[PDB]
């Protein structure tokens, strides 16, 4: 498994060699591989040239965002709530959390 | 702005220029030139006497001094001083300043080998140039006073010697008593080169020599528009025979109307014109042997789709009657 952070900087103008070798390893190698590019430059596909993009399997996946106000409210509830029993305070602590969270005027 | 220009001049080829130039510089003012050369010959004992005092002798004046320095340094002085100290005579190290390829490292690598390698000075070789010459200086303060070397620096305002890290290098050489420094400059702003720091190290004295010499060697590296209309004059002499004809049809209607943009021709009709005389098959076969006129910058294009020749009105009819015909 390949883990690539900031693969856009490898996608420079001049050489692009290292991308070209791993993407051809998809095509021919008996060793099963998988490549994982992580970046933040959105239109990553135009940054590549022609001969590398044809090696590429073209499948990108966009990462989601918090699209509604209710979503992160649901997230912070799952974030702060403890579910496993450790402390005597826990059952008291869990209902204090949501009571602040359920009230929209809190 | 009707200006007469060097393009509108009766030009002269390569062999025609240099031969008649060689006629003047060896026959114009020959009698008074050696008549000057015999007059200044009596100053030669005076230079010998002052040069024992370690004085950096500097020659200014109009005209080239290159011939005069080489007579004065080689034939006159360098065996005269060897005879007066008492065996090979004193080594002469000239420096051609008009040659731009002079560096500070290479000439000083000659110097420490010209001077005595009495110690392991390669141990101090590690910019150690000012460091290595400083260890040379203080040792030379306590040596017996005699000249062992005379160096000549022609054209001290030259393109490489006038660089400032090289100038200070020569400054520390001149304070040493064992070497005599006989140099010449030609610039009118040559005393801009030195402050009272360097001239303290230099103790320059000055003498006029004006023989109005032509500077044969010193003209070679220099260039003007004598040295393109003349550039593409030679490429057409070695090509295919069809390119002569398609340039002839090019040059006619481009001179039908200086040779500027407005006299030029459109690409479509010129394709049809060079299709009319059974020359151009199509656009690609036209353009490919037109890129060869483009690659050697023999024609221009601006925007009709105007291709025009960048040579003058007078030049194209010269290109007509001589090389095309």
């Amino acid at each position: 498994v390949f883990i690539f952070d900031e693969i856009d900087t490898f996608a420079g103008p001049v050489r692009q060699t290292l991308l070209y070798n791993l993407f051809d390893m998809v095509e021919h190698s008996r060793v099963p591989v998988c490549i994982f590019g992580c970046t933040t430059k959105l239109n990553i596909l135009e940054y590549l040239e022609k001969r590398v993009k044809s090696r590429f399997s073209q499948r990108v996946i966009y990462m989601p965002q918090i699209q509604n106000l209710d979503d992160m409210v649901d997230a912070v509830r799952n974030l702060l709530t403890v579910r496993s029993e450790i402390s005597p305070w826990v059952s008291q602590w869990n209902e204090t959390l949501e009571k602040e969270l359920s009230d929209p005027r809190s | 702005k009707s200006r007469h220009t060097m393009s509108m001049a009766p030009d002269v080829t390569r062999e025609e220029f240099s031969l008649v130039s060689n006629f003047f510089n060896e026959n114009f003012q020959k009698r008074p030139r050696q008549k000057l050369f015999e007059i200044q010959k009596k100053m030669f004992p005076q230079y010998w006497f002052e040069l024992t005092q370690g004085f950096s002798l500097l020659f200014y004046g109009v005209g080239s001094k290159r011939n005069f320095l080489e007579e004065f340094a080689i034939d006159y002085l360098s065996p005269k001083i060897a005879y007066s100290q008492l065996v090979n005579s004193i080594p002469c190290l000239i420096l051609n300043g008009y040659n731009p390829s002079c560096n500070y490292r290479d000439v000083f690598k000659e110097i420490t080998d010209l001077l005595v390698p009495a110690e392991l000075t390669r141990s101090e070789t590690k910019n150690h140039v000012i460091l290595q010459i400083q260890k040379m200086i203080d040792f030379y303060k306590n040596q017996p006073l005699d000249i062992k070397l005379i160096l000549v620096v022609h054209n001290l305002d030259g393109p490489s010697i006038r660089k400032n890290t090289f100038q200070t290098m020569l400054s520390f050489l001149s304070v040493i008593r064992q070497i005599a420094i006989v140099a010449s400059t030609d610039h009118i702003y040559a005393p801009l080169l030195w402050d009272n720091m360097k001239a303290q190290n230099y103790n320059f004295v000055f003498h006029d020599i004006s023989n109005f010499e032509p500077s044969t060697v010193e003209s070679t590296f220099q260039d003007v528009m004598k040295m393109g209309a003349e550039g593409a004059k030679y490429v057409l002499q070695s090509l295919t025979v069809n390119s002569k004809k398609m340039y002839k049809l090019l040059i006619e209607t481009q001179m039908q109307n200086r040779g500027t943009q407005r006299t030029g021709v459109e690409l479509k009709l010129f394709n049809h014109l060079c299709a009319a005389d059974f020359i151009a098959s199509n656009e690609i076969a036209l353009r490919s042997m037109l890129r060869e006129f483009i690659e050697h910058k023999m024609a221009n294009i601006t925007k009709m789709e105007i291709i025009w020749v960048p040579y003058t009105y007078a030049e194209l009819e010269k290109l007509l009657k001589t090389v095309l015909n």
Binding site: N43, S54, Y62, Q65 | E295
Partner: protein, 420 residues
């Protein structure tokens, strides 16, 4: 060679070979050709003559990537092993420095490691002295041309020696390459063979798919109903609708004519039906099946459709507040490139031209003790967030007022996505 013995491990716990697993095994890009059938001969008959006559020639082929020129010349030499030569894949892009290919050649004649300098001396000493057979592939020639053409002159000057036992095969990106990068002195040595490779056509793009689908199209699998494992309790079949394969062909031949792009869009569309089949029954990982036309409709569109429009409407408020200010200046001035201080000048002005509960929060997160902010809250943050997203672009200056800002996506779609 060595370590492939060490790349093997033992415990392989019975991986589920589902219905669409056996498709992707042959839909792998590895394993006579229909489309470039006669041009295979045009290479080979150009190659067969020089091989059996001990000469030195040059063969120049061009074309867009995805047309088989990586493939076809491998099929040339492959049959030739049956009937005197040393095969090397001198790839251009697989060389780190351009001079490093020189090391390979001197390595691949005797087995010595010498410098790029010392190799080409003995290479030149080889190519004009040996009494009397080398096949070399100079792939992806855009890489080895870049510096000063002194490398490229060598690779064809060796061909000129009549005592040079070498056969070169150049494969480029464009036919134009010895006319817009090289000199004419190389262009004399390149020859005028110039075998052009076009794209593929959509009829042949059907004829390339079924070569992978030879023994598996409309065939039968043996399946247990409990694990989803398929074997070449039911005995099920799986069919491929050829019209959807056709509409895959009529797009890829239209835009690119690329043989990887045709296979991979079928490969992407194959796994869409894989997860929907796993969604309905859940066999995990431990009557008659098909692939609809609706799969390749999505996956071909999945090559096209974006998200920056969906990204922009799912951004923060002050992000959408920022761009709406930025288009306001671009229709005020018509200069498409506005100074950064004027934007901060505008977002102040776009307040006073619920808004107060906004304007309280927009410059301080509540807090009477620490209010009175000049520029807005997290203004460095959203401008950094719009920068690394690629939507915006900001030139570098230590002044944080007169540094110019330029848009990077089309401003109309920025205007259009703002409307939501």
């Amino acid at each position: 060679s060595r370590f492939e013995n060490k790349l093997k491990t033992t415990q392989k716990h019975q991986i589920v070979e589902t219905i669409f697993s056996k498709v992707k095994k042959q839909l792998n890009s590895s394993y006579y050709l229909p489309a470039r059938e006669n041009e295979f001969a045009s290479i080979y008959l150009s190659a067969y003559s020089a091989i059996e006559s001990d000469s030195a020639t040059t063969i120049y082929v061009a074309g867009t990537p995805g047309v088989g020129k990586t493939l076809t010349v491998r099929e040339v030499v492959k049959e030739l092993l049956s009937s005197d030569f040393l095969y090397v894949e001198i790839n251009g892009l697989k060389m780190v420095k351009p001079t490093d290919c020189y090391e390979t050649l001197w390595n691949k004649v005797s087995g010595e490691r010498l410098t790029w300098a010392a190799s080409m001396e003995s290479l030149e000493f080889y190519f004009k002295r040996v009494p009397k057979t080398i096949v070399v592939l100079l792939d992806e020639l855009d890489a080895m041309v870049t510096k000063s053409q002194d490398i490229m002159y060598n690779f064809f000057n060796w061909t000129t020696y009549e005592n040079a036992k070498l056969i070169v095969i150049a494969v480029a990106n464009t036919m134009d390459l010895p006319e817009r990068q090289l000199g004419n002195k190389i262009t004399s040595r390149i020859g005028f063979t110039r075998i052009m490779f076009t794209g593929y056509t959509h009829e042949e793009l059907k004829n390339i798919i079924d070569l992978r689908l030879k023994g598996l199209n409309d065939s039968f699998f043996y399946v247990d109903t409990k694990t989803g494992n398929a074997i070449l309790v039911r005995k099920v079949r799986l069919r491929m609708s050829a019209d959807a394969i056709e509409i895959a062909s009529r797009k890829v031949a239209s835009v690119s004519g690329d043989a990887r792009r045709a296979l991979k869009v079928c490969k992407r569309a194959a796994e869409i039906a894989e997860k929907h089949y796993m969604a309905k029954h859940g066999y995990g990982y431990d009557g008659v099946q098909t692939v609809h036309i609706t799969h390749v409709m999505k996956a071909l569109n999945e090559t096209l459709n974006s998200h920056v429009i969906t990204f922009m409407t799912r951004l923060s408020f002050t992000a959408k507040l920022f761009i709406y200010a930025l288009l306001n200046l671009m229709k005020k001035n018509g200069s498409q490139e506005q100074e950064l201080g004027d934007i901060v000048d505008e977002i102040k002005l776009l307040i006073e031209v619920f808004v107060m509960e906004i304007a309280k929060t927009l410059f301080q997160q509540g807090s009477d003790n620490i209010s009175e902010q000049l520029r807005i809250i997290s203004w460095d943050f959203v401008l950094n967030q719009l920068l690394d997203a690629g939507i915006l672009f900001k030139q570098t200056m230590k002044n944080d007022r007169i540094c110019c800002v330029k848009l990077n996506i089309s401003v109309e779609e920025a205007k259009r996505a703002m409307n939501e």
